[PDB]
Amino acid sequence: DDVRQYVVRKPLNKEGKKPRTKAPKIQRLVTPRVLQHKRRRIALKKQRTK
RNA sequence: UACCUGGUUGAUCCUGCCAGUAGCAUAUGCUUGUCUCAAAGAUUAAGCCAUGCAUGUCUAAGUACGCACGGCCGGUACAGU
Numbered sequence: 001d002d003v004r005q006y007v008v009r010k011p012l013n014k015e016g017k018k019p020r021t022k023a024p025k026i027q028r029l030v031t032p033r034v035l036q037h038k039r040r041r042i043a044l045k046k047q048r049t050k
Numbered sequence: 051u052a053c054c055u056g057g058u059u060g061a062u063c064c065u066g067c068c069a070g071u072a073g074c075a076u077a078u079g080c081u082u083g084u085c086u087c088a089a090a091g092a093u094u095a096a097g098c099c100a101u102g103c104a105u106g107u108c109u110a111a112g113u114a115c116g117c118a119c120g121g122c123c124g125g126u127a128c129a130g131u
Contacts, residue, residue, distance in 0.1 A: 004127070014117050022115045026127045033127095 003029060 003026065012020040
């Protein structure tokens with residue numbers, strides 16, 4: 001399942017500005033950037049053996 | 051700049067020390083217009099200390115749900131300060 005969309009949201013209300021909602025940055029999500037760092041980590045091992 | 055002078059006797063020649071003469075660095079007295087440098091609670095007590103200051107620190111790159119401030123609307127991890 002997708003871990004996004006199920007994340008809890010916090011509503012903001014005050015007399016001045018418009019309503020808003022907040023949610024946190026997610027800390028173990030395995031995005032494409034995490035996978036890209038894992039690929040270079042093993043490309044450096046191959047270069048040293050050559 | 052490798053230098054001496056007064057003082058023992060009625061007078062002389064010596065020994066020998068006292069006093070004078072020049073510099074240096076601590077205190078102290080009288081006196082003082084301009085201008086460039088600049089030592090300064092070591093000496094006695096490593097004695098006793100009111101008050102203030104004398105050591106802090108963030109980048110594109112460890113952790114941002116602070117309505118704290120904010121955008122054109124939306125969290126697509128999640129904007130931005």
